[PDB]
Amino acid sequence: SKPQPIAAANWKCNGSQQSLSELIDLFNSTSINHDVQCVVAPSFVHLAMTKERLSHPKFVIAAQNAGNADGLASLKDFGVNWIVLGHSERRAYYGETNEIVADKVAAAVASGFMVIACIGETLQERESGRTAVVVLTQIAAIAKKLKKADWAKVVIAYEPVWAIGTGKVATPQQAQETHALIRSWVSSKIGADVAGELRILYGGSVNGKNARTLYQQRDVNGFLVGGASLKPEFVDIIKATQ
Amino acid sequence: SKPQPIAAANWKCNGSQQSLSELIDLFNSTSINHDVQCVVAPSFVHLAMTKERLSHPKFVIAAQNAGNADGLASLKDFGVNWIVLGHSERRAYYGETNEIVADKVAAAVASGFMVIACIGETLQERESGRTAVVVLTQIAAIAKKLKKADWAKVVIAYEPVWAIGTGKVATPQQAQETHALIRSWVSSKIGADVAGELRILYGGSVNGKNARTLYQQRDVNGFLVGGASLKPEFVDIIKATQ
C-alpha cells in the first residue's frame, strides 16, 4: 500500500509569463483520476500570478528556499502552504551543512508548512560508492531536529546532484534501492507507521518516458521535476503515478 | 580612465573533476598581456581541488553565496578572499530582500573579503520599464550598509535575470545604459572618486563573440561568466577586456 503520490514541478525560466500561463491552462484543463497531489513551485516573483490562475483542485502552490523567519511568515500569510528545500544542490555548490537544512525543515514545519526536503549525493560520491552514507547522514540530521508528528508534514525527495539537468536519470532499480534504504532507516529509527506513510519522491532528469517505470517501484512515491515540468509532458509524469 | 577590469568565472557542472582540471591546465598555461583580475568561483565541492591546481598569477578563487559567519571564517582560513553574492537570482527565485543582500555585503567586507554583488531586474520588470527603479533600489540598499572606505572592497555586477543562462544577452547599449545609471547614482550619493574607481561588471549570456563589443562601452569594467566560463572561449572573454 502506497501513500498518496506526489508530482512536483520546479519552475525557473526567465523569458516570459506567456509560457507559464499556457502551461497553467493546460494543467487546468487536464483530467486526473487517481489520488495524487500535484505541486507547482514557480519563481517567487511568479507566485501571485500562479496562485490566481492555477485552479486545478489537485494542484497546490509551493515556495522555494525561503532563507528567513520573516520570509516563512509572509509566505504562510499569503496562502502558501508548501515549500521545497534544494539541499542537495546547495550542499554541493555552497557548502550548506546538513544541520542547517535540518534546522530549516524544522523551522518550516513549525511555521505551518508541508516541506519537500531534497537530499542527495554528488557525482564524485556516487562514483566512490557513498550514496548510502551521504543520503542516510542527511536524513539522520533532519530526524535530529524533527518530532515524530513532524513527519506527517515532511516529504523526502531523493534528488542526486548528478541527475539534476544533466540528462542522466537513476534506473528503476537504482532509485528503488536508495528509497528502500531511506524508508527502512526511518522505520527502525522513528517507527513503521511513519516509514510507511512517508512519501519519498525521486528527482533528477525525470521525464514523461521514464516516470511510468520508476513509479512501479515499491518505495517510489512520486517525482520532483525541473526541465520536464515546463513542458506538456508533465501531464504524462502525473499520469505515471498510478 | 577605466579602472582595472575583472573577468569572473562561475563553475557548476557536477561530473567535472576531469573537465574542470582540463580548464585549469588550460588557464594556467594562458599568457595574459594586460592588467586584469581574473576570478574563478568553483562550486564549494571543488574548492580544494581548484585551489590546488590553479596557479596563474592573474587568477584568484572566489566562493559563491557564502551565507554564514562561521562559513566566512572557514573561507578566510582556507585562503579564499573573494565571494560572489547571486542576489539578482535569489531575489527573483526566492524573494531575497535587498536589505538581506546589503547585510551580507557589509558582513563580507568587515571580514576582509572582496565582494562581487550581483544586482539586476526580472524579465517582467524589464518589459514594464522598471529596470532603473529596480536596479537603483538594489544599489541604494547595499550603499546604506557601507562606509566610503568599504567601496574599495566592492565590485558590482549588473546581472539581469532574463539574460542568465537563457542565451538572451543584453545589447551593448542596454548594458551601458544601466551601468551609467548605477555609476551616476554612486557619484551623486557617494562621490565622484568612489564612482570612477568602482568596477561595474556585466553578466548574462556573455560569450567569446559578444564580449569584445561589450567591453568597448565606457562604463563596462568586465564580466561575470557562467556557461561560457566552462569552455575554452573564456580565454577570449578575458582578452576582450581591453
Catalytic residues of B: 87, 159
Distance CA A41, CA A44 (A): 8
Could you tell me which of A135, A115, A116 has the C-alpha nearest to residue A125? A135
Report chain A residues touching chain B, CB-CB < 8 A.
Answer: 12-17, 43-45, 63-68, 71, 91-95, 100, 122-124, 161-162, 164, 166
Owner of C-alpha cell 562601452:
B217
Distance CA A154, CA A82 (A): 10
- Considering all CA atoms of chain A, what is the largest pairwise distance in Å, rounded to the nearest integer? 48
Owner of C-alpha cell 487546468:
A28
A159 is catalytic: yes
A94–B17 CB contact, under 8 Å: no
Distance CA A55, CA A42 (A): 15
In A, minimum Cα distance to B86 occurs at A94
Residue type, B228: A
Angle at B108 between CA B107 and CA B110, to 5 degrees: 65
A94–B67 CB contact, under 8 Å: yes
Residue type, A157: A
Could you tell me which of B186, B211, B212 has the C-alpha nearest to residue B200? B186
Distance CA A147, CA B199 (A): 49
Across the interface, which of B74, B95, B122 has its CB nearest the CB of A71?
B95
Residue type, A242: Q
B14–A122 CB contact, under 8 Å: yes
Report chain B residues touching chain A, CB-CB < 8 A.
Answer: 12, 14-17, 43-45, 47, 63-68, 71, 74, 91-96, 100, 122-124, 161-166, 168
Integer-rounded Cα Rg, in Å, for chain A is: 17
B67–A16 CB contact, under 8 Å: no
Would you call A27 helix, strand, or coil by DSSP? helix
What residues of chain B lie within 8 A of the CB of A43, using their CB?
92-93, 122
Distance CA A207, CA B220 (A): 41
Task: Tell me the C-alpha to C-alpha distance, in Å, between residue B70 and each of A91, A164, B62, B82, B111.
Answer: 15, 28, 17, 16, 11
Owner of C-alpha cell 502552490:
A61
Distance CA A231, CA B235 (A): 36
* Bridge partners of residue A117, in order along the sequence: A85, A156
A94–B64 CB contact, under 8 Å: yes
Distance of CA B217 to the CA centre of its chain: 17
Residue type, A236: D
Integer-rounded Cα Rg, in Å, for chain B is: 17
Among A96, A121, A125, A159, the active-site one is: A159
Residue A211 has φ and ψ, to the nearest 5°, of -45, -55
Per-residue burial over B82-105, b = 16 or more CB atoms within 10 Å of its CB, e = otherwise: bbbbbbbbbbbbbbbbbebbbebb
Query: Binding site for substrate, residues of B?
Result: 10, 12
Distance CA B199, CA B224 (A): 12
CB B42 within 8 A of CB B12: no
Would you call B83 helix, strand, or coil by DSSP? strand
Could you tell me which of A30, A155, A58 has the C-alpha nearest to residue A105? A155
Q: How far apart are the first and last CA of chain A?
A: 12
Distance CA A114, CA A122 (A): 26
The stretches of chain A forming alpha helices (DSSP H) are 18-29, 47-53, 69-77, 87-94, 98-110, 123-127, 131-144, 172-189, 192-197, 211-216, 234-239
Give the total residue count for chain B: 242
Per-residue burial over B145-169, b = 16 or more CB atoms within 10 Å of its CB, e = otherwise: bbeeebbebbbbbbbbbbbbeeeeb
Task: Tell me the C-alpha to C-alpha distance, in Å, between residue A11 and each of A24, A52, B74.
Answer: 12, 16, 33
Distance of CA B42 to the CA centre of its chain: 13
> What are B94's three cell numbers?
526566492
A95–B17 CB contact, under 8 Å: no
CB A217 within 8 A of CB A171: no
> What element of type H or E holds B180?
helix B172-189
What residues of chain A lie within 8 A of the CB of B66, using their CB?
94-95
Distance CA A68, CA A108 (A): 10
Owner of C-alpha cell 547614482:
B185
**Domains in chain B, CATH or no CATH each:** 1-242 (3.20.20.70)
What residues of chain B lie within 8 A of the CB of A161, using their CB?
14
Would you call A64 helix, strand, or coil by DSSP? strand
> What element of type H or E holds B64?
strand B59-64
Residue B107 has φ and ψ, to the nearest 5°, of -65, -40
What residues of chain A lie within 8 A of the CB of B93, using their CB?
12, 43-44, 64-65
A179 is catalytic: no
CB B114 within 8 A of CB B80: no
Could you tell me which of B153, B155, B152 has the C-alpha nearest to residue B182? B155
Would you call B145 helix, strand, or coil by DSSP? coil
In B, minimum Cα distance to A126 occurs at B15
State the smallest CA–CA distance between residue A41 and chain B in angstroms: 10
What residues of chain B lie within 8 A of the CB of A91, using their CB?
44
Task: Tell me the C-alpha to C-alpha distance, in Å, between residue A192 and each of A188, A196, A201.
Answer: 7, 6, 18
Task: Tell me the C-alpha to C-alpha distance, in Å, between residue B27 and each of B4, B20, B41, B229.
Answer: 19, 10, 14, 11
What residues of chain A lie within 8 A of the CB of B67, using their CB?
67, 94
* Bridge partners of residue B222, in order along the sequence: B6
Distance CA A107, CA A125 (A): 29
B122–A14 CB contact, under 8 Å: yes
* CA dihedral for B149, B155, B158, B164, sign (positive or negative): negative
Would you call A156 helix, strand, or coil by DSSP? strand
Angle at B225 between CA B167 and CA B41, to 5 degrees: 140
* Bridge partners of residue B200, in order along the sequence: B156
- Residue A149: burial class (beta carbons within 10 Å; 0-12, 13-18, 19+): exposed
Task: Tell me the C-alpha to C-alpha distance, in Å, between residue A45 and each of B88, B91, B166.
Answer: 12, 8, 18
CB A84 within 8 A of CB A118: yes
Owner of C-alpha cell 563580507:
B108
> What are A75's three cell numbers?
509566505
DSSP conformational letter for B157: E
> B123 Cβ partners below 8 Å, 6+ apart?
A14, A15, A16, B161, B162
B96–A12 CB contact, under 8 Å: no
In B, minimum Cα distance to A64 occurs at B94
Among A87, A96, A121, A179, the active-site one is: A87
State the smallest CA–CA distance between residue A71 and chain B in angstroms: 8
DSSP string over chain B: -----EEEEE---SS-HHHHHHHHHHHHT----S--EEEEE--GGGHHHHHHH---TTEEEEEE----HHHHHHHHHTT--EEEE-HHHHHHHH---HHHHHHHHHHHHHTT-EEEEEE---HHHHHTT-HHHHHHHHHHHHHHT--GGGGGGEEEEE--GGGSSSS-PPPHHHHHHHHHHHHHHHHHHT-HHHHHH-EEEEESS--TTTHHHHHTSTT--EEEESTTSSSTTHHHHHHT--
Distance CA B36, CA B71 (A): 28
Would you call B66 helix, strand, or coil by DSSP? coil
DSSP conformational letter for A16: -
> What element of type H or E holds A203?
strand A200-203
In B, minimum Cα distance to A43 occurs at B93
> A133 Cβ partners below 8 Å, 6+ apart?
none
Distance CA B67, CA B103 (A): 10
Q: Report resolution in angstroms.
A: 2.1
DSSP conformational letter for A157: E
Per-residue burial over B106-143, b = 16 or more CB atoms within 10 Å of its CB, e = otherwise: bbbbebebbbbbbbbbbbbbbeeeebeebbbebbebbb
DSSP conformational letter for B240: T
* CA dihedral for B68, B70, B74, B80, sign (positive or negative): positive
